[PDB]
Amino acid sequence: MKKLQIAVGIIRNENNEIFITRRAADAHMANKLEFPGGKIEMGETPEQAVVRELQEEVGITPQHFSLFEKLEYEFPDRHITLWFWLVERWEGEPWGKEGQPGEWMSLVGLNADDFPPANEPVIAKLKRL
Numbered sequence: 001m002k003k004l005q006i007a008v009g010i011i012r013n014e015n016n017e018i019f020i021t022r023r024a025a026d027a028h029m030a031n032k033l034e035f036p037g038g039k040i041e042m043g044e045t046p047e048q049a050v051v052r053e054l055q056e057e058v059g060i061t062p063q064h065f066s067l068f069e070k071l072e073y074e075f076p077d078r079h080i081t082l083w084f085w086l087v088e089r090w091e092g093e094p095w096g097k098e099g100q101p102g103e104w105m106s107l108v109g110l111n112a113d114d115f116p117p118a119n120e121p122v123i124a125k126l127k128r129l
């Protein structure tokens with residue numbers, strides 16, 4: 001069974017909205033809502049990975065961010081460690097830089113059922129802020 005380290009960014013604006021993308025229909029966790037992010041590569045740190053992934057996926061450079069949650073999740077065919085970074089300052093304006101759907105979503109309106117099940121405790125903890 002594959003093992004991966006994944007870094008994702010919770011991109012939160014001043015109006016308590018989060019920038020959320022939707023995964024492709026042929027991806028793992030297909031059609032799910034997601035925090036932008038991706039695999040931490042050999043030779044880069046979790047902090048470097050979340051910067052690079054947000055630059056690639058949505059065209060922003062996160063800065064002065066914090067680790068909101070780190071957790072492990074066993075999917076049916078892979079084990080993933082997820083690093084959830086809270087990103088409240090960034091350079092740029094997030095968009096669907098890889099052609100993927102992305103939009104701002106109110107924190108209070110997030111439905112954990114729309115995301116991979118690994119995100120459940122994070123979405124709950126976010127709504128507690």
Ligand SMILES: Nc1nc2c([nH]c(=O)n2[C@H]2C[C@H](O)[C@@H](COP(=O)(O)OP(=O)(O)OP(=O)(O)O)O2)c(=O)[nH]1
Pocket residue numbers: 006008027028029033034035036037038039080082116117118119
């Ligand atoms: N990006 C992201 N992935 C998540 C979240 N929750 C969650 O369980 N995952 C899982 C889905 C995938 O198994 C893995 C994310 O990998 P990915 O498909 O984003 O990796 P990547 O962007 O580097 O892949 P690629 O560009 O090479 O296609 O972690 C989330 O909120 N955001």
Ligand SMILES: OC[C@H]1O[C@@](CO)(O[C@H]2O[C@H](CO)[C@@H](O)[C@H](O)[C@H]2O)[C@@H](O)[C@@H]1O
Pocket residue numbers: 047063064065066067
């Ligand atoms: O690990 C994040 C944690 O570290 C602090 C400093 O105590 O921030 C540092 O790390 C961030 C991630 O690289 C940087 O964005 C930040 O500029 C740096 O000071 C805390 O702010 C944060 O909780």
Ligand SMILES: [Mn+2]
Pocket residue numbers: 037038039053056057
């Ligand atoms: Mn990616």
Ligand SMILES: [Mn+2]
Pocket residue numbers: 038039053
């Ligand atoms: Mn990647």
Ligand SMILES: [Mn+2]
Pocket residue numbers: 036037038039057
């Ligand atoms: Mn990704």
